[PDB]
Write a protein that holds these residues in place. Structure first.
Motif, short mmCIF file in Angstrom:
data_model
loop_
_atom_site.label_atom_id
_atom_site.label_comp_id
_atom_site.label_asym_id
_atom_site.label_seq_id
_atom_site.Cartn_x
_atom_site.Cartn_y
_atom_site.Cartn_z
N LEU A 155 9.84 2.87 6.05
CA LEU A 155 8.98 2.98 7.23
C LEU A 155 8.10 1.75 7.44
O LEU A 155 7.27 1.70 8.36
CB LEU A 155 8.01 4.17 7.04
N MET A 156 8.23 0.72 6.59
CA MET A 156 7.65 -0.59 6.81
C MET A 156 8.74 -1.62 7.10
O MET A 156 8.45 -2.78 7.37
CB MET A 156 6.89 -1.08 5.54
N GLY A 157 10.03 -1.21 7.04
CA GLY A 157 11.18 -2.09 7.27
C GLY A 157 11.37 -3.23 6.29
O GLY A 157 11.81 -4.32 6.65
N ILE A 158 11.01 -3.01 5.00
CA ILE A 158 10.99 -4.05 3.98
C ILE A 158 11.76 -3.56 2.75
O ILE A 158 12.30 -2.45 2.70
CB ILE A 158 9.57 -4.42 3.53
N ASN A 159 11.85 -4.39 1.70
CA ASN A 159 12.65 -4.12 0.52
C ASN A 159 11.86 -3.53 -0.65
O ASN A 159 10.77 -3.98 -0.99
CB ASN A 159 13.29 -5.50 0.11
N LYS A 190 -3.53 -1.89 7.30
CA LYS A 190 -2.50 -1.53 8.27
C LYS A 190 -3.00 -0.53 9.32
O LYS A 190 -2.62 -0.59 10.48
CB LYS A 190 -1.24 -0.99 7.52
#
Lengths: 152, 96
Positions: free
Chosen positions: B35-39, B79
Motif C-alpha cells: 500500500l506504499m508501492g515499494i519493496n 505521511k
C-alpha cells in the motif's frame, strides 16, 4: 494624530512580556529560541533545555517553576487565560522533526504514482542518527539538506 | 490513510544476542509495502540497518528496538501530515 481634544486612558491591557518570554530570539532569549539552539548540541537533552530555561527566564514576571518535577521536567507560564504547566519531555525531537532518510528515498521512487507525488520533495528531509536512550539522549549529526538551508 | 494505520502494526522485538532488533513477522511490513508501492526487503533493510552518509563517509549500521519503533512512528505521522497538505492544496486548486 488628528489632534482632537482627548486625554489618554490606560485600560491596563497589554500581554507583551508574556509574548517576549516565548518569542524573543536575541538579547534575553525566549522559550522557542533556547529550544531552537539546545537542539543542535550533542550533550543536550529535553532536561538540559529546562535547566537552561531557569537560567535565562527564572525570575521573569510571567514565568514559574513546577511543583518540583525536574524528573519529568516541566515549567509553568502565566498566560492571559491562566497558568499552564508545560512538560518539556521529547520537545527537542519535536522541534527538530527528524526522519529516517534511507526509507524516505524509497518512497520518492515508488511504483505508486500517488505515493511518489506525495513524497516528491525529499530535498529537505533531515538525517541526524539520534540515539533516543533515556537519561543520556545522544545527538549525532548526519545532515542532508540541499544548499544547507534547514530550519527548526 | 490505511497505510498510516498499518505502520502501527509493525513490531520490533529486542534481540538479546546483538542488542539490536529484527522484524519477526513479514505480514505487517508486506501489507505496508504493498500500500506504499515499494519493496519489502529494501524497506526492511532501511528500517533496521540503514546505509546513511555522514558528510564524507558511508555509515552502514544497525538501529536498536527503540530507534526502529521511533523510525516507523515518525514515518506514519509524516505521511499523514503530507496527506493533509496535499488535500489542502487540492481544495485550494478548485476554489481560487
Amino acid at each position: 494624530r488628528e489632534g482632537i481634544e482627548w486625554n489618554f486612558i490606560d485600560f491596563g491591557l497589554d500581554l507583551q512580556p508574556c509574548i517576549e518570554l516565548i518569542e524573543r530570539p536575541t538579547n534575553p532569549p525566549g522559550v522557542l529560541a533556547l529550544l531552537d539552539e539546545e537542539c543542535w548540541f550533542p550533550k543536550a537533552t529535553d532536561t538540559s533545555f529546562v535547566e537552561k530555561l531557569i537560567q535565562e527566564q527564572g525570575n521573569h514576571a510571567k514565568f514559574q517553576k513546577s511543583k518540583q518535577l525536574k524528573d519529568k521536567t516541566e515549567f509553568c507560564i502565566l498566560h492571559y487565560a491562566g497558568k499552564v504547566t508545560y512538560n518539556a519531555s521529547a520537545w527537542l525531537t519535536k522541534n527538530m522533526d527528524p526522519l529516517n532518510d534511507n526509507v524516505t528515498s524509497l518512497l520518492n521512487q515508488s511504483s505508486d504514482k500517488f505515493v511518489a507525488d506525495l513524497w516528491k520533495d525529499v530535498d529537505r528531509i533531515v538525517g541526524l542518527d539520534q540515539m533516543a536512550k533515556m537519561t543520556e539522549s545522544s545527538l549525532p549529526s548526519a545532515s542532508k539538506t540541499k544548499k544547507g538551508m534547514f530550519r527548526t | 490513510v490505511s497505510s498510516v494505520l498499518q505502520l502501527g502494526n509493525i513490531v520490533f522485538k529486542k534481540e538479546r544476542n546483538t542488542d539490536q532488533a529484527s522484524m519477526p513477522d513479514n505480514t505487517a511490513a508486506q501489507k505496508v509495502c504493498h500500500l506504499m508501492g515499494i519493496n519489502v526487503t529494501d524497506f526492511t533493510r532501511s528500517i533496521l540497518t540503514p546505509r546513511i552518509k555522514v558528510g564524507r563517509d558511508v555509515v552502514q549500521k544497525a538501529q536498536t528496538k527503540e530507534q526502529a519503533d521511533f523510525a516507523i512512528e515518525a514515518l506514519a505521522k509524516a505521511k499523514f501530515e503530507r496527506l493533509f497538505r496535499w488535500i489542502l492544496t487540492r481544495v485550494n486548486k478548485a476554489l481560487d
